[PDB]
């Protein structure tokens, strides 16, 4: 589980300032 690995998880502040989320 990661900010963008399936299932993506950019629904977090510590996983949003990324290049795969923002």
Curated annotation (Swiss-Prot):
Result, substituting residue 2 to N: Increase in activity on Nav channel from eel electric membranes, and decrease in binding to rat Nav1.4/SCN4A by increasing the rate of dissociation from rat Nav1.4/SCN4A channel and decreasing the rate of association
SS bond partners: 3-15, 4-20, 10-21
Residue(s) carrying Alanine amide: 22
Miscellaneous note of the record: Negative results: does not or only weakly blocks rNav1.3/SCN3A, rNav1.5/SCN5A, rNav1.7/SCN9A (IC(50)=6.0 uM and >100 uM), and rNav1.8/SCN10A.
Subcellular location field: Secreted
Tissue expression from the record: Expressed by the venom duct.
UniProt family annotation: Belongs to the conotoxin M superfamily.
Species name: Conus geographus (Geography cone)
Post-translational modification summary for this protein: Hydroxylated; hydroxylations improve the ability to block Nav1.4/SCN4A sodium channels but does not affect folding.
Protein name: Mu-conotoxin GIIIA
UniProt remark on domains: The cysteine framework is III (CC-C-C-CC).
Result after altering residue 13 to Q: Loss of activity on Nav channel from eel electric membranes, and important decrease in binding to rat Nav1.4/SCN4A by increasing the rate of dissociation from rat Nav1.4/SCN4A channel without modifying the rate of association
Positions of modified residues (4-hydroxyproline): 6-7, 17
Chain positions of site Important for binding sodium channel: 13
Protein purpose: Mu-conotoxins block voltage-gated sodium channels (Nav). This toxin potently blocks rat Nav1.4/SCN4A (IC(50)= 19-110 nM). It also moderately blocks rNav1.1/SCN1A (Kd=260 nM), rNav1.2/SCN2A (IC(50)=2.7-17.8 uM), and mNav1.6/SCN8A (IC(50)=680 nM). The inhibition is reversible. In vivo, induces paralysis to an isolated skeletal muscle preparation from frog (cutaneous pectoralis) within a few minutes.
Span of the entire protein shown here: 52 to 73 of 75
């Amino acid at each position: 589980r990661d900010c963008c690995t399936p299932p993506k998880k950019c629904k977090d502040r510590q996983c949003k300032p990324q290049r795969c989320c923002a």
